[PDB]
Design a protein around this ligand. Structure first.
Ligand SMILES: Nc1cc(Nc2ccc(S(N)(=O)=O)cc2)ncn1
Length: 287
């Protein structure tokens, strides 16, 4: 579009390139992403919340679609890589987890799911805020095996009910993803770095135990389930995210529950004792 001045490529998303751009009219600096779907996007423009990257505009032109979002200076992946040596302090890990749960609770309350949470889509600013980007685009446009650049879409944060072929998942898939992200900020290593759908499922099984009819009623009937899956024992949590404390380990165990109906909701998670002492520190951001 002619109203925006591209300032630089931020990177390649699922659906297309993402640029930093200046609006010539209003002078704002935004993130320009080149991409029923139209009807879907328009619903999202209305779901505003402090921890959700604002959707400013939707420009469909010549069968060409562009989304204009609020711009933030850095993503959680880069931030994690830069704090790799010392680790992000716990007070900041807690404040981020806390804010992200506030964002999921709002969206989930309007029955909108994210479906593809990952560090690349969690954006931060110098004031200690963290927000979720691309919320709802998966349902609008779905999730491909490969991006527009043929890049592999990461499976690291995918919930087990999705890997087992359930067609109608719930908001429980986002809590699983976020719990994988919490574990990663803590240990400074991805929890389940799968390189294929089966390696991803088997990595989950090896740490959390092959699920059964006792812990996940109905699991054995799922479309992609196989009696031949190996049966690994569940590991103990202290070995999972050391040295996280017991409140943190408890909340995480609740976010990684196999049965989606038992998995904690975002709203209940915000009440967990882990948050009693939550504060809002600021990252040391060098832009
Ligand atoms: N998808 C985005 C991204 C974005 N900005 C942004 C994201 C990542 C980076 S990085 N790779 O430098 O951390 C920089 C800016 N702002 C809004 N939407």
């Amino acid at each position: 579009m002619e109203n925006f001045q591209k300032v630089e490529k931020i990177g390649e998303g699922t659906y297309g390139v993402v640029y930093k751009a200046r609006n010539k009219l209003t002078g704002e600096v935004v993130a320009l992403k080149k991409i029923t779907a139209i009807r879907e996007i328009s619903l999202l423009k209305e779901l505003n919340h402090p921890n959700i990257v604002k959707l400013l505009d939707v420009i469909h032109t010549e069968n060409k679609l562009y989304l204009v979002f609020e711009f933030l200076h850095q993503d959680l992946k880069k931030f994690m890589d830069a704090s790799a040596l010392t680790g992000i302090p716990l007070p900041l890990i807690k404040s981020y987890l806390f804010q992200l749960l506030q964002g999921l609770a709002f969206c989930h309350s309007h029955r909108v799911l994210h479906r593809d949470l990952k560090p690349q889509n969690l954006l931060i600013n110098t004031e200690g805020a963290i927000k979720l980007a691309d919320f709802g685009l998966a349902r609008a446009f779905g999730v491909p095996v490969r991006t527009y650049t043929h890049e592999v879409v990461t499976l690291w944060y995918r919930a087990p009910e999705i890997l087992l072929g359930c067609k109608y998942y719930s908001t429980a898939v986002d809590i699983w993803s976020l719990g994988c992200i919490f574990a990663e900020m803590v240990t400074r290593r991805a929890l389940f770095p799968g390189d294929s759908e089966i390696d991803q499922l088997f990595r989950i099984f090896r740490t959390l135990g092959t699920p059964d009819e006792v812990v996940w009623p109905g699991v054995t009937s799922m479309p992609d389930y196989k009696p031949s899956f190996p049966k690994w024992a569940r590991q103990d949590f202290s070995k999972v995210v050391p040295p996280l404390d017991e409140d943190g380990r408890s909340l995480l165990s609740q976010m990684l529950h196999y049965d989606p109906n038992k998995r904690i909701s975002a709203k209940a998670a915000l009440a967990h004792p882990f948050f009693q002492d939550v504060t809002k520190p600021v990252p040391h951001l060098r832009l």
